[PDB]
Amino acid sequence: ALHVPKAPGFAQMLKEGAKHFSGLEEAVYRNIQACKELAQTTRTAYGPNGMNKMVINHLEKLFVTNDAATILRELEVQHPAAKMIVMASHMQEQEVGDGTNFVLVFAGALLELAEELLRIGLSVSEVIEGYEIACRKAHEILPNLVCCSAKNLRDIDEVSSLLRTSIMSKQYGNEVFLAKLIAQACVSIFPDSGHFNVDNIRVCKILGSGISSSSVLHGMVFKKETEGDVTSVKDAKIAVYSCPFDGMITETKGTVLIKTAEELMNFSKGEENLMDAQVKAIADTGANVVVTGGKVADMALHYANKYNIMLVRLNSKWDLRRLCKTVGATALPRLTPPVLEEMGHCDSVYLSEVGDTQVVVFKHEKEDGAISTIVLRGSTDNLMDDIERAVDDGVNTFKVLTRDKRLVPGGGATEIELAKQITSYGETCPGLEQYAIKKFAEAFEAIPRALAENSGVKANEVISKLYAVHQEGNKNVGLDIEAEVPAVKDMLEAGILDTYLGKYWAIKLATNAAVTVLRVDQIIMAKPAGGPKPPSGK
Amino acid sequence: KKSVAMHTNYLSACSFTNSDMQILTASGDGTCALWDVESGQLLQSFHGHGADVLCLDLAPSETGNTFVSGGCDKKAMVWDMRSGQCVQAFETHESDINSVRYYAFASGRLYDLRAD
Amino acid sequence: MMPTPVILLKEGTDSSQGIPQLVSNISACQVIAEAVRTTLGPRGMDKLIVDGRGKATISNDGATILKLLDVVHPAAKTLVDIAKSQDAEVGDGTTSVTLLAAEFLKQVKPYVEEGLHPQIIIRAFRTATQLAVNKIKEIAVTVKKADKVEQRKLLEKCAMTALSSKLISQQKAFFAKMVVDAVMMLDDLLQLKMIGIKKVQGGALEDSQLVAGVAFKKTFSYAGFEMQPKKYHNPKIALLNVELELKAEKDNAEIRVHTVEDYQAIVDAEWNILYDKLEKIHHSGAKVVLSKLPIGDVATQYFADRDMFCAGRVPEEDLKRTMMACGGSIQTSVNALSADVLGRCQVFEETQIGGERYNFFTGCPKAKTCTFILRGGAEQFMEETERSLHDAIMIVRRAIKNDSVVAGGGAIEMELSKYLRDYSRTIPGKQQLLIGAYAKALEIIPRQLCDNAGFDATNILNKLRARHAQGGTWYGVDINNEDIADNFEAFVWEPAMVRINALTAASEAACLIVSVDETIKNPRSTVD
Ligand SMILES: Nc1ncnc2c1ncn2[C@@H]1O[C@H](COP(=O)(O)OP(=O)(O)O)[C@@H](O)[C@H]1O
Ligand SMILES: Nc1ncnc2c1ncn2[C@@H]1O[C@H](COP(=O)(O)OP(=O)(O)O)[C@@H](O)[C@H]1O
Numbered sequence A: 001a002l003h004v005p006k007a008p009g010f011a012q013m014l015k016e017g018a019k020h021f022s023g024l025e026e027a028v029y030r031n032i033q034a035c036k037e038l039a040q041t042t043r044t045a046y047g048p049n050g051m052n053k054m055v056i057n058h059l060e061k062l063f064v065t066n067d068a069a070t071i072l073r074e075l076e077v078q079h080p081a082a083k084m085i086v087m088a089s090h091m092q093e094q095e096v097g098d099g100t101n102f103v104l105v106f107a108g109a110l111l112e113l114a115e116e117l118l119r120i121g122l123s124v125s126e127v128i129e130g131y132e133i134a135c136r137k138a139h140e141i142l143p144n145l146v147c148c149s150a151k152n153l154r155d156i157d158e159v160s161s162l163l164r165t166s167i168m169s170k171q172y173g174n175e176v177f178l179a180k181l182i183a184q185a186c187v188s189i190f191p192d193s194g195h196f197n198v199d200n201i202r203v204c205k206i207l208g209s210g211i212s213s214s215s216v217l218h219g220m221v222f223k224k225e226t227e228g229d230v231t232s233v234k235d236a237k238i239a240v241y242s243c244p245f246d247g248m249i250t251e252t253k254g255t256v257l258i259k260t261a262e263e264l265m266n267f268s269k270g271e272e273n274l275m276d277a278q279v280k281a282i283a284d285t286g287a288n289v290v291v292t293g294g295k296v297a298d299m300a301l302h303y304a305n306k307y308n309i310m311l312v313r314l315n316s317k318w319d320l321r322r323l324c325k326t327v328g329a330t331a332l333p334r335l336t337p338p339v340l341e342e343m344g345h346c347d348s349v350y351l352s353e354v355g356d357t358q359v360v361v362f363k364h365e366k367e368d369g370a371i372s373t374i375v376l377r378g379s380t381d382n383l384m385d386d387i388e389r390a391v392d393d394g395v396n397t398f399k400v401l402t403r404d405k406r407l408v409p410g411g412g413a414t415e416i417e418l419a420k421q422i423t424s425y426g427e428t429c430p431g432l433e434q435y436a437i438k439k440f441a442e443a444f445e446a447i448p449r450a451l452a453e454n455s456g457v458k459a460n461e462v463i464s465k466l467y468a469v470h471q472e473g474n475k476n477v478g479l480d481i482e483a484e485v486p487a488v489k490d491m492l493e494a495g496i497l498d499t500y501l502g503k504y505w506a507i508k509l510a511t512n513a514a515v516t517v518l519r520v521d522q523i524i525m526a527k528p529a530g531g532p533k534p535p536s537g538k
Numbered sequence B: 001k002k003s004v005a006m007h008t009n010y011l012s013a014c015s016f017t018n019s020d021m022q023i024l025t026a027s028g029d030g031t032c033a034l035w036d037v038e039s040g041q042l043l044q045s046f047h048g049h050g051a052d053v054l055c056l057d058l059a060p061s062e063t064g065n066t067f068v069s070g071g072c073d074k075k076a077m078v079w080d081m082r083s084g085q086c087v088q089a090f091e092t093h094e095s096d097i098n099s100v101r102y103y104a105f106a107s108g109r110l111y112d113l114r115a116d
Numbered sequence C: 001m002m003p004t005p006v007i008l009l010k011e012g013t014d015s016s017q018g019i020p021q022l023v024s025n026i027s028a029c030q031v032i033a034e035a036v037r038t039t040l041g042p043r044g045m046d047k048l049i050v051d052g053r054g055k056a057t058i059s060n061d062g063a064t065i066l067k068l069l070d071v072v073h074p075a076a077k078t079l080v081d082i083a084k085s086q087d088a089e090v091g092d093g094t095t096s097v098t099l100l101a102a103e104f105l106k107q108v109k110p111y112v113e114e115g116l117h118p119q120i121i122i123r124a125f126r127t128a129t130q131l132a133v134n135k136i137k138e139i140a141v142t143v144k145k146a147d148k149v150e151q152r153k154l155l156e157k158c159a160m161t162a163l164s165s166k167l168i169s170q171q172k173a174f175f176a177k178m179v180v181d182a183v184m185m186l187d188d189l190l191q192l193k194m195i196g197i198k199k200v201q202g203g204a205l206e207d208s209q210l211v212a213g214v215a216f217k218k219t220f221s222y223a224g225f226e227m228q229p230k231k232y233h234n235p236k237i238a239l240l241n242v243e244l245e246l247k248a249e250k251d252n253a254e255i256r257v258h259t260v261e262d263y264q265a266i267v268d269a270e271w272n273i274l275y276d277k278l279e280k281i282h283h284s285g286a287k288v289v290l291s292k293l294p295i296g297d298v299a300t301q302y303f304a305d306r307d308m309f310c311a312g313r314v315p316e317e318d319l320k321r322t323m324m325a326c327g328g329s330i331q332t333s334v335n336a337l338s339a340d341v342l343g344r345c346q347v348f349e350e351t352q353i354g355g356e357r358y359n360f361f362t363g364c365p366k367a368k369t370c371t372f373i374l375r376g377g378a379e380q381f382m383e384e385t386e387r388s389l390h391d392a393i394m395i396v397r398r399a400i401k402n403d404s405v406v407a408g409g410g411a412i413e414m415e416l417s418k419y420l421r422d423y424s425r426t427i428p429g430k431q432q433l434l435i436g437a438y439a440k441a442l443e444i445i446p447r448q449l450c451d452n453a454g455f456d457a458t459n460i461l462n463k464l465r466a467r468h469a470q471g472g473t474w475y476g477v478d479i480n481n482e483d484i485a486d487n488f489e490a491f492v493w494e495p496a497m498v499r500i501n502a503l504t505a506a507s508e509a510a511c512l513i514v515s516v517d518e519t520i521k522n523p524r525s526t527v528d
């Protein structure tokens, strides 16, 4: 009478390292607790007043940021329910590009209130159906909350105003400068065709001068140096080659068969003459700049220097393709001279030094082109990485605006209005699902509450004032972070707006993740293996 | 196989000569030895290099007449079949040269025969 | 907390959040600043750091000292990063950036401790930095006369000021004259690789020389080299990238013959190929032959027989400098050795410098390159002399780009502190305390100068504050006379961009450090 044996059946048949969790208390409450803890970890970075977090991964790599997706990526999350929440956040990042922290906060609030509802007596299925009904109602309501539209995208001022809010949550101190930069970069891209490519915006990070010195370049910047002697060209006629700048060789096997003295004495001279003829044939077309994707031979370099040809060697094939898009050239597979259609033209190619790094710049002059580059300055690599993340968020916001031009008020105005109308709808619905609908409505309060907490004011006062104002009939009133006391203001005049697609997708994904977590009833975890990562991840 | 096994001490390295007629061996006493595969006689034993040899390299362009040997004497010294003498030696190495690669030859320091 | 049978993050994850972690970050930044604190000023001292391998580095450079320090604190790495940034963009002031950032953080640590919102501090820093940069641009002294003599004097004074904190400060005028002369001969890009830095052991600092041309160490001469003449009075230099050796025609080449006549013909053909290359080089008219690829003993003897000079295996950068000095072109083929691609120098000579043989190419009238030959009693001595000369060269290049100067010795920062205090005394008041803290933190550099010099920092700071308040912009610390003086009249000049970049980087680092509220450290993977 001093030990409790394992129950016969599955308990004894379980493996030595496996774990089995079954039932409400063992599985659902634990999953809800883990998701709530993850949301608590990521909460403090929400909003413009969010605080940066230094996250160090297993490779001692710094990550100072307030981007929820990046923080979760660099965190070694182990709880599988938190893994679903992180996957939902990453899916939101992939689909839209912004709203990951919204996904975390909404999922955490939904799961907390689901735990409350399960405690008070509701079943899991009833909570799930109420959540789904409330999500459908919210998606029905959301189009009616659209305040304004982009109504143009080729402009600079209003595009910058639209993009300001997206990059105001991050880099809160100086967002107008970044908004202008990203607006210029995006307007250079996005031609008459409605298709907008995010990858056409390039970010170059050069250290030393502070982020206020960052600029936008209508071209491409490579951190390389010219192979030859020429370092500047004013009327570039770039010819791009995907082959090494050398005489091509047989693919099977090369063997110089010598049988007489004359052949031995003439072979090298003839090879050099052939190289010279090829280089001169390339130069005779007017191509004063040659870009190659492979190595550069010594004789080829010498004969290129003889004819005043600027050489740039690009190792990455992605860089070669991007340069071809920027200049308008075709990467020739052989070393033949390019025809007039295959020769790219750039208004200026030269070697320059920015700060310390030597760079090669393919610079246009027209306010157009296939690819635009943003050169980022700064005093720290981490700071430039954070600015790059902000630029990525702004570009994704511009792409979303190209997809859908509708906007909704930010700063919790949309969330508060949604909560009010969902509560009003649920007050009329009979049955047990009304509790779940009301809890889903209340879960929207976590956004303005988080904004107020990060801003440093009393959340309850802000929420009560927001309800009062929205009951008065003002649907565009949100938290005013430019105050030391709980205050609200109209966000349409302030220009604080969020994309309709972002809110729609974030709500949908958060609700889906919450109901998927709630659906789990039993957990069977294998013993954690010591294998060096799955073979799928290489 | 040759399997001669005429040796009082162990063999640090048994390098078959590029010419397909004879073998070159160095015992544990630091003396290299040349054996004829066909006849079996020891053509000549190379004196000097008191510490045990550790690597043997024949000439690469056939020329089965010169080779370089190095061991625990911190030495890189070159021989000659036609005279049985140390024609060239080196002093840069200072620690028990393990392996030698013939280019000049690189041992572990790239030596050049044309300039010592 | 609770065991939580299944946990959220991986075991061993260490997290720190709240005010205590920010205070710890500020303390770490203070610790980093302490390690370079005594290296600032003409009375600064060197630091010695030994790595695991046993090699010692002696340097007065803040960036070098910080890099040799292996900092692992996440917040402390920001100071090292901004020091590297200052070194890259400017090249001087790598101690001032760290001192200013740490002083900013130390000044705002008390306000952090009562729970002030970090965003307010960040905004105050941004506003103060913008105002300070604008003031620096406004009051910086510039001369719009384009006088060559005045420009040379300004460059020399800036180089002297940048050099009067190192071990070569005793010969600071002489080294500054070298640096200005070397920089003025670069053509348009002021590329650093076009200035050679050669360190030869032995000799005093006054034995160091600047070569109006190119010089490099003798490179593994072959047999018969000593028979070549070692002095020419109007040589023509052949810059080649060619292997003058008896070797296989190609790696994949293979010769098949079935007659002894063809065997002899092949041997004579190889010899004739080598001799044809050599004969072309000789008939080109050149007397000095330099190649990047090895030059064999046969070619060495061939050139010795013709009273010619040969030097193979020359480093690529040395060949480029020889190009920029003599004015030739590196040829991978000798089939067309015209007079256009042949270098020309007035005098070529091989001499002995401290037990080493060096080749000299002097007399170049249109040289676009230089070569510093540094003499010293130890390798670390020459290394630190090179670092100081690099600082001076970067300063002179920046001054060439824009000759906007401000007085040193902390005068500019005392003026900035007075201006910022005057501005802060006219604002609502929550930002006023933070801007006043910024202005007070701006006083660290003159105080550190006084502390390093053995002064009394409080009295000197009081006198400086009174002088700036009553009128006077360029009054700073006078190290020699234990007092203050008009540093502009004392020719203690710095480029304005040095202080601009220092303030910008320090403010950015302080804002980034303050903006962090939580630090998370994942457990180490593959500890091995
Ligand atoms: N100037 C502002 N005032 C008040 N709220 C703002 C302001 N700018 C942005 N917000 C709010 O901050 C939220 C964005 O938070 P953010 O940190 O971007 O998280 P996520 O990246 O997940 O969207 C938006 O919902 C928006 O309503
Ligand atoms: N002759 C001088 N008199 C007074 N102060 C000087 C003098 N020369 C340099 N300084 C001061 O030294 C500071 C820089 O120190 P230094 O070690 O030379 O460069 P760094 O800032 O890179 O460490 C400058 O702020 C300058 O005011």
Ligand SMILES: [Mg+2]
Residues within 6 Å of the ligand: A098, A099, A100, A166, A169, A393
């Ligand atoms: Mg966002």
Ligand SMILES: [Mg+2]
Residues within 6 Å of the ligand: C092, C093, C161, C162, C163, C165, C391
């Ligand atoms: Mg200095």
